[PDB]
């Protein structure tokens, strides 16, 4: 680990059907959060597993159903296990359940009301930099375009852990500093984000055989982090923020711009936020 | 201990899903079985204790603050839930099988030439649907209704939708008017009954089921499973598949676009999914290649 002495203060979030759970504990005895998910099964190796002599122990059975506790070898236990040290009070409150409420932000919302709120934040993004100048997972870049205006990396995200395509995951993050979402983009950025969809849809080719019409190619709005980035993902996968009320493809994005220069700046955005968030209250009203 | 057959050989997978770590296969023996195998949910005290003491740890990668790691944890936390059916039925495999999809672009002009020619040269009924609207069936379940036969619906629980906890929430708009096959038919003519279904259909969740407007995903789906125009109410909480962004169009927007752009929906590319054994799939990616 990257300390010693691991005790919990709150279970963050847990979620029996994500298999995925948030610990904060106090360490060195600082604030750190844990986060541990089960992996994503591999089919070749279950497949071998189940035609071998597999330790089972059986719970039930009814006629031509039959329930049993598998115990798999050291294989197919892996836990994905992502750690924060050290964790931030905004880690501490991100993760908390909290309820989900839909707003629907106009153009003059955004720029009178959320971007305001967006710049009385500073919240630390030093791993995206970090990545963008080769300062860390220098090795894991997938593809780069290296010109500073149009140009961007294409990476894994931190979420797939590359053991099987069924969760393939990669971001896209621009070089290009000072756009910090969705609203953000106009005429200017086409090539950027042309770059992204073609060059990026490219690369995955190559790399992991995958064709474009294996994949669901879109923005977060809100994003989780404020620099703008584009998430690759099966298009079997359930990926974060998929759903309507946040993902947004990008070849919609792109013709967008094409068909209305000001479309990300005039239109009205529907997204959630959490009841906590002061955002919410300061657009419900104005 | 032991399982009820002999040399399992995968056939197919039916259906996986990484999000909630479970995978249902389809395998041959000896002659057909299904397992089902659910990774399980955490007993966080056995964690919790183990991250203070020798968990077996190996580092994927680190950038500033964070790291990631690969677990191997000891036994009575690597339970893995597997249910079989042997013999599995054949309407067992139609069941769990969920068919691999394909994302297709479909344009204004691919529409027109490729998909509604072979939609007209099915037959689907949407007998059931009629039923609703004229009352025939279902008339105790009605939530709400908006009787003008151009612009005004019937809100109904879906089927699926057991109506005991507010948790899955889910119920559909049928608009009285006929002929609107989907998302592709909806001009500013529409833009009345659009707007009819979303303000009094959401109204109407709030005085029912105590539901405010911002818990509730409103939403239509493209391509549709019935060529009649409806759309979904769900609560925002609950995920119901259909509500992918290759799937789901909100209501607020599709109604929003009609405002900007009149013939937005016969004109724009609309992106959807089909199985890849779907005849449509493959005839729009000929007149593509
Ligand atoms: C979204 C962000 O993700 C990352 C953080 C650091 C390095 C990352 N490196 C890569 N390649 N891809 C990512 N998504 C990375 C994040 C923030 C807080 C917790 C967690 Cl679990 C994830
Ligand atoms: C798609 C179709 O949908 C319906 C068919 C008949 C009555 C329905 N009534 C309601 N309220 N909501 C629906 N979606 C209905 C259908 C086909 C086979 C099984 C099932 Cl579970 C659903």
């Not at 780069?144 to 931190?158: A, K, Q, T």
């Not at 290009?176 to 849809?201: A, C, K, M, W, Y």
């Not at 879109?218 to 703008?228: D, F, I, R, V």
Request: charged share 25%; with cysteine; glycine share 4%.
């Amino acid at each position: 680990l990257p300390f010693s002495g691991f005790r919990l203060q709150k279970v963050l979030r847990e979620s029996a059907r994500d298999k995925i759970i948030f610990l904060h504990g106090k360490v060195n005895e600082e604030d750190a959060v844990v986060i541990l998910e089960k992996t994503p099964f591999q089919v070749e190796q279950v497949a071998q597993l189940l035609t071998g002599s597999p330790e089972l122990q059986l719970q039930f059975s009814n006629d031509i159903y039959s329930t049993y506790h598998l115990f798999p070898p050291r294989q197919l236990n892996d836990v994905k296990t992502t750690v924060v040290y050290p964790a931030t009070e905004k880690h501490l409150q991100k993760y908390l359940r909290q309820d989900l409420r839909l707003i629907r932000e106009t153009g003059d919302d955004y720029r009178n009301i959320t971007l305001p709120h967006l710049e009385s934040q500073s919240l630390s993004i030093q791993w995206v930099y970090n990545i963008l100048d080769k300062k860390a997972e220098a090795d894991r870049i997938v593809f780069e375009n290296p010109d500073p205006s149009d140009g961007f990396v294409l990476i894994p995200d931190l979420k797939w852990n590359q053991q099987q395509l069924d969760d393939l995951y990669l971001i896209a993050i621009c070089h290009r500093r000072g756009i910090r979402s969705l609203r953000d983009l106009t005429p200017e950025h086409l090539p950027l984000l042309r770059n992204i969809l073609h060059q990026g849809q490219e690369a995955i080719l190559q790399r992991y055989r995958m064709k474009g019409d294996h994949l669901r190619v879109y923005l977060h709005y809100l994003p989780s982090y404020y620099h703008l980035h584009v998430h690759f993902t099966a298009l079997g996968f359930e990926a974060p923020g998929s759903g309507v009320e946040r993902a947004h493809l990008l070849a919609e994005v792109i013709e967008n711009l094409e068909c209305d220069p000001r479309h990300y700046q005039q239109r009205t955005l529907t997204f959630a936020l959490r009841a906590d968030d002061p955002l919410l209250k300061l657009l419900q009203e104005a």
